[PDB]
């Protein structure tokens, strides 16, 4: 058009329509006087060869041809139809799955309780009980409250108002209401009081956590009884009371000063349990008024990160299928040495930022609070005392009469009751008050909630007079096991940055502060009954990015139903036993097509059917996976590979797993899998890297690798050393110079020209430095401190008289000088030793098969050298690790090439050539 080019909507850029001398001038003055923003530059979209003009759907929905179901799986068959002059990117495809989910009775997406949270945890509800008479003869005792002040009390109840001349009485079904009482702080004469009380027939439960559903629209909870005529009727019964002194009188003066509305209710404790059960005897009693409640542990339950586990991968028995209708041959070739899920995890990390959540794919990385993993104990800022005061601001007082002086005398005084009251309330001295250390309490609560309750089960004990399951994998067991707060109190490693030794080997991601798991639990909702509707992506490396040319194709895949696989819980309890169930109602397949111009689509199809233009992909992980059993408490882990070809071997990577948290894939269903926590093998939530000591690599036999006198200790890879006489540790921890150098080179190629912090983009979530956490602390020297004394938790007393004894129960004992912990600071500091260690979560240990350990090219220089390229070699690796009281696994990834070439010669045909070297099929 004419005016567009003039107004620079269209036309040429500023560099082209301006004076050449001015453009030259602008380039010269750019650095100190830019003129770019002064002149418009047009941007024009192409008008032809891009988009079609005929009617064309952007999204196709395919309902499955055939669906089969077992108890633990279900396979769906789709006929993916790519029409002519249409082009489909498999990245734009996903399965739309809908069903009903039941997370079960162990799902608790919150801490604390929903009911009477502010109530003191030992305070009972207004209750009654039968008790031995003793002056069988029994009598009923009442313990209650009467907050409502009424007009009068007759046999018709408490008078709550008047309707002209008629007195109005409380509707027993909901009046008086328990949340109503006096509106002023100071005392008043209440000659006609009323309240509600629970009958002796209703079990005794502490107020904290008490819930009784309502039986009427006005909030009444009185259980209704079905009468003969078939109508429901209230069983609320009135109980009148007067003072014992008043009942001593003859009787004519006898009148009730209190009326309690006694009722039965369906009490329950949905989200709390009993922390102190005084007696095993069942039935209401005065003793049972002392039982204390405690909120049930939080247990978030959701679908896994990136919907890990929903789709079968790397399972020969349940292999996905993509094929052309014509050719019966399948394009998918899956192996059990492949790890598709973990590959997708690390791939996603390499591409983008895993800290960001994307609801569609359940893309929310598993994580843990850093201040929970490593405790950084600064103590508390409690310099100022904190006080609570009387609601009146004064407290108890005495009554005083005013007096006035005899103004003509030295010290004469006279009563003055004419103008002033003789009962004036005055308190002499400071007001009444109580004291609390708020920050100390908050710190203590944090430690007990996030750390103490997660200690290994060997440090807990079974509650007294409370039934508990026999299965340690159940929520009931994890919830009722008692941990004493003194194990993780305010004074733990005070002033150190130090993770508890007992917690190092505990999966930090099985925690209620796992932000990712929590987000994925709340994406479903806050209830256990959840109708869900989700989108599941294709992760197999050969397909997920394939560009499918016209033709029809069978796309068939298998899916899991195992709650322990498809669901994830923060506590890891066995969701099979704990009542979780899932049902997949329907499934569809959605494919998004570029509305490509038909001439362009045909030309591109033609170009892509040629041999030279076969599409090629490879697994990001690019490794063959091997798991070697490490029996309990074993430190030496020997493994050997028979003589074979190593051409293109890229290197080793390894970490350590727990057999409990690692399911046996390929079987289709693991009957011995009793765990619903994170699965590091799949999601990359590794956390046992610190338990490695050293690795010995021996090619063939007697040939050490890398040898050549390279390392400070050349025969073996020394990861960490306990007290190095040589002084080969680094970075103020127990890691070796050799190992640190190797890892820095493997991850960033830094070692040889100085050590520094890698660039952020190079140091990602699963990188080494990002997760490298060295730590040190001091501890009493039991040999050199002459006054040492071993005082277990049973006889430690710090904050005695203000905390519970060995339980999260109530205040107990007396004030007394502490006997624990030993002071490591100040004039009286004890002789101390120093312990160094480190943590390295999420990352993998890397030994690249490179001459200088660097990354100069995927195909390592050693992967090409003559020795390993034109000969066969057997391998013998020996890992020395820290002992652990349960079976573990050595996870070794043999870094190789895992490539696939994909050829589409004709419409509806698809051929694939798979190669993985070293370690071929």
Binding footprint of another protein on the chain (CB under 8 A): 406-412, 414
> Of 217 and 410, which CB lies nearer to another protein in the complex structure?
410
Q: Kindly state the smallest distance separating residue 407's Cβ from another protein, in Å.
A: 4
Q: Kindly state the smallest distance separating residue 250's Cβ from another protein, in Å.
A: 46
> Of 43 and 418, which CB lies nearer to another protein in the complex structure?
418
Q: Kindly state the smallest distance separating residue 422's Cβ from another protein, in Å.
A: 18
Are 462 and 481 in contact, with CB atoms under 8 Å apart? yes
Are 264 and 202 in contact, with CB atoms under 8 Å apart? yes
> Of 250 and 411, which CB lies nearer to another protein in the complex structure?
411
Which of these, 611, 609, 617, 589, lies nearest to 549 by C-alpha position? 609
- The rounded Cα 521 to chain-centroid distance in angstroms is 9
Give a three-class secondary structure readout of 23-40. HHHHHHHCCCCCCHHHCC
Are 322 and 551 in contact, with CB atoms under 8 Å apart? no
> Of 59 and 411, which CB lies nearer to another protein in the complex structure?
411
Give the C-alpha distances (Å, rounded to integers) separating 323 from 548, 551, 666.
11, 10, 22
Q: Kindly state the smallest distance separating residue 421's Cβ from another protein, in Å.
A: 18
- The rounded Cα 778 to chain-centroid distance in angstroms is 31
Dist. CA 909–CA 902, nearest whole Å: 11
Are 330 and 322 in contact, with CB atoms under 8 Å apart? yes
User: Exposure pattern of 319-357 as b/e (b: 16+ CB <10 Å)?
Assistant: bbbbbbeeeeebbbebbebbbbbbbbbbbbbeeeebeee
Give the C-alpha distances (Å, rounded to integers) separating 126 from 256, 264, 546.
19, 12, 69
> Of 408 and 642, which CB lies nearer to another protein in the complex structure?
408
Q: Kindly state the smallest distance separating residue 178's Cβ from another protein, in Å.
A: 53
Q: Kindly state the smallest distance separating residue 413's Cβ from another protein, in Å.
A: 11
Dist. CA 158–CA 147, nearest whole Å: 12
Q: Kindly state the smallest distance separating residue 403's Cβ from another protein, in Å.
A: 13
Q: Kindly state the smallest distance separating residue 418's Cβ from another protein, in Å.
A: 8
- Tokens 């190095």: give the residue: 724
> Of 84 and 416, which CB lies nearer to another protein in the complex structure?
416
Dist. CA 122–CA 111, nearest whole Å: 18
Q: Where are the beta strands (DSSP E) in 416-514?
A: 424-426, 434-436, 497-498
Give a three-class secondary structure readout of 866-921. HHHHCCEEEEEEEEEECCCCCCEEEEEEEECEEEEEEECCCCCCCEEEEEEECCCC
> Of 164 and 408, which CB lies nearer to another protein in the complex structure?
408
Q: HSE on the CB side for 780, CA within 13 Å?
A: 15
> Of 411 and 790, which CB lies nearer to another protein in the complex structure?
411
Q: Kindly state the smallest distance separating residue 423's Cβ from another protein, in Å.
A: 23
- Tokens 């904290």: give the residue: 208
Dist. CA 835–CA 574, nearest whole Å: 37
> Of 270 and 405, which CB lies nearer to another protein in the complex structure?
405
Q: Kindly state the smallest distance separating residue 414's Cβ from another protein, in Å.
A: 7
Q: Kindly state the smallest distance separating residue 420's Cβ from another protein, in Å.
A: 14
Q: Kindly state the smallest distance separating residue 237's Cβ from another protein, in Å.
A: 60
CA 497-502-508 angle, to 5 degrees, is: 75
Regarding beta strands 888-895 and 772-780, do their DSSP bridges make them parallel or antiparallel, or are they unpaired? unpaired
> Of 282 and 414, which CB lies nearer to another protein in the complex structure?
414
CA 692, 698, 702, 703 dihedral sign is negative
> Of 404 and 906, which CB lies nearer to another protein in the complex structure?
404
> Of 415 and 784, which CB lies nearer to another protein in the complex structure?
415
Contacts of 355 (CB under 8 A, 6+ apart): 365, 765
Q: Kindly state the smallest distance separating residue 419's Cβ from another protein, in Å.
A: 10
> Of 229 and 407, which CB lies nearer to another protein in the complex structure?
407
Q: Kindly state the smallest distance separating residue 411's Cβ from another protein, in Å.
A: 6
> Of 252 and 419, which CB lies nearer to another protein in the complex structure?
419
Dist. CA 350–CA 156, nearest whole Å: 77
CA 603, 608, 613, 615 dihedral sign is positive
Reported as type and span, the H/E element at residue 781 is none
């Amino acid at each position: 058009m004419p005016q567009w080019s003039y107004m620079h909507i269209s036309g040429q850029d500023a560099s082209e329509y301006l004076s050449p001398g001015l453009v030259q001038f602008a380039r010269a003055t750019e650095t100190y006087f830019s003129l770019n923003n002064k002149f418009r530059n047009p941007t024009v979209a192409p008008t032809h060869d891009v988009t079609t003009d005929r009617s064309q759907r952007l999204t196709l929905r395919f309902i499955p041809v055939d669906r089969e179901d077992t108890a633990y799986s279900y396979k769906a068959r789709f006929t993916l139809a790519v029409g002519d002059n249409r082009v489909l990117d498999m990245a734009s495809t996903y399965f739309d799955i809908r069903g009903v989910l039941d997370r079960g009775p162990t799902f608790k997406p919150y801490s604390g309780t929903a009911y009477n949270a502010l109530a003191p945890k030992g305070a009972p509800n207004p209750c009654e009980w039968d008790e031995a008479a003793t002056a069988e003869q029994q009598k009923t005792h009442v313990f209650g409250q009467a907050p409502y002040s009424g007009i009068n009390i007759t046999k018709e109840g408490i008078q709550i108002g008047v309707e002209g001349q008629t007195p109005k009485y409380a509707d027993k079904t909901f009046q008086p209401e328990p949340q109503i009482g006096e509106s002023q702080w100071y005392e008043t004469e209440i000659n006609h009081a009323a309240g509600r009380v629970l009958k002796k027939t209703t079990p005794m439960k502490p107020c904290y956590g008490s819930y009784a559903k309502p039986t009427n629209e006005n909030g009444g909870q009185g259980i209704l009884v079905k009468q003969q005529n078939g109508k429901l009727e209230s069983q609320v019964e009135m109980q009148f009371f007067s003072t014992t002194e008043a009942a001593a009188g003859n009787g004519d003066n006898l009148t009730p000063k209190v009326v309690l509305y006694s009722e039965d209710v369906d009490i329950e404790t949905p989200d709390t349990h009993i922390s102190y059960m005084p007696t095993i005897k069942e039935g209401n009693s005065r003793e049972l008024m002392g039982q204390q409640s405690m909120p049930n542990r939080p247990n978030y339950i959701a679908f896994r990160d990136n919907f890990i586990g929903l789709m079968y991968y790397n399972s020969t028995g349940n292999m996905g299928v993509l094929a052309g209708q014509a050719s019966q041959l399948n394009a998918v070739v899956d192996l059990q040495d492949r790890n598709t899920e973990l590959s997708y995890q690390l791939l996603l990390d390499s591409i983008g930022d895993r800290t960001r959540y994307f609801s569609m794919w359940n893309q929310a990385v598993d994580s843990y609070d850093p201040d929970v993993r490593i405790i950084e104990n600064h103590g508390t800022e409690d310099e100022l005392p904190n006080y609570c005061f009387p609601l009146g601001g004064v407290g108890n007082n005495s009554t005083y009469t005013k007096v006035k002086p005899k103004t003509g005398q030295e010290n004469g005084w006279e009563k003055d009751a004419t103008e002033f009251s003789d009962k004036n309330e005055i308190r002499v001295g400071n007001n009444f008050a109580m004291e609390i250390n708020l920050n100390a309490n908050l710190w203590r609560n944090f430690l007990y909630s996030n750390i103490a309750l997660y200690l290994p089960d060997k440090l807990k004990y079974s509650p007294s007079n409370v039934k508990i399951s026999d299965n340690p994998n159940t929520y009931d067991y994890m919830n009722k096991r008692v941990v004493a707060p003194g194990l993780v109190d305010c004074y733990i490693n005070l002033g150190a940055r130090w993770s508890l030794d007992y917690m190092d080997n505990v999966n930090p991601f099985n925690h209620h502060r796992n932000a990712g798991l929590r987000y994925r639990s709340m994406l479903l909702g806050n209830g256990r009954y959840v109708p869900f509707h989700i989108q599941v992506p294709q992760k197999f490396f050969a397909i997920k990015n394939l560009l499918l040319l016209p033709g029809s194709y069978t796309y068939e895949w298998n899916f899991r139903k195992d709650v322990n696989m498809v669901l994830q819980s923060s506590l890891g309890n066995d969701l099979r036993v704990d009542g979780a169930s899932i049902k997949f109602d329907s499934i569809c397949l959605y494919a998004t097509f570029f509305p490509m111009a038909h001439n362009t689509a045909s030309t591109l199809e033609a170009m892509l059917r040629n041999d030279t233009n076969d599409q090629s992909f490879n697994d990001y992980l690019s490794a063959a996976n091997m798991l070697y059993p490490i029996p309990a408490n074993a430190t030496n882990v020997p493994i050997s590979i028979p003589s074979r070809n190593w051409a293109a071997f890229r290197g080793w990577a390894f970490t350590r797993l727990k057999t409990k948290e690692t399911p046996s894939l390929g079987s289709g269903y693991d009957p011995y899998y009793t765990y619903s926590g994170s699965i590091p093998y799949l999601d990359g939530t590794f956390y046992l890297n610190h338990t490695f000591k050293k690795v010995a690599i021996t090619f063939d036999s007697s040939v050490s690798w890398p040898g050549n006198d390279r390392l400070l200790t050349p025969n073996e890879f020394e990861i960490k050393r306990s007290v190095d006489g040589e002084g080969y540790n680094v970075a103020q921890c127990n890691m070796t110079k050799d190992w640190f150098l190797v890892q820095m080179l493997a991850n960033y190629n830094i070692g040889y020209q100085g050590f520094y912090i890698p660039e952020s983009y190079k140091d990602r979530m699963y990188s080494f430095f990002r997760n490298f956490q060295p730590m040190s602390r001091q501890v009493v020297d039991d040999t050199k401190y002459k006054d040492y004394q071993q005082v277990g938790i049973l006889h430690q007393h710090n904050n005695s008289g203000f905390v519970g004894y060995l339980a999260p129960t109530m205040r107990e004992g007396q004030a007394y000088p502490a006997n624990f912990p030993y002071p490591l600071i100040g004039k009286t500091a004890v002789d101390s030793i120093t312990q160094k260690k480190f943590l390295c979560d999420r990352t993998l240990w890397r030994i690249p098969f490179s001459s200088n350990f660097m990354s100069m090219g995927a195909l390592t220089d050693l992967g090409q050298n003559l020795l390993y390229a034109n000969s066969a070699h057997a391998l013998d690796m020996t890992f020395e690790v820290d002992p652990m009281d349960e079976p573990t696994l050595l996870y070794v990834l043999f870094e190789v090439f895992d490539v696939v070439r994909v050829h589409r010669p004709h419409r509806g045909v698809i051929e694939t050539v798979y190669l993985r070297t070293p370690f071929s099929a």
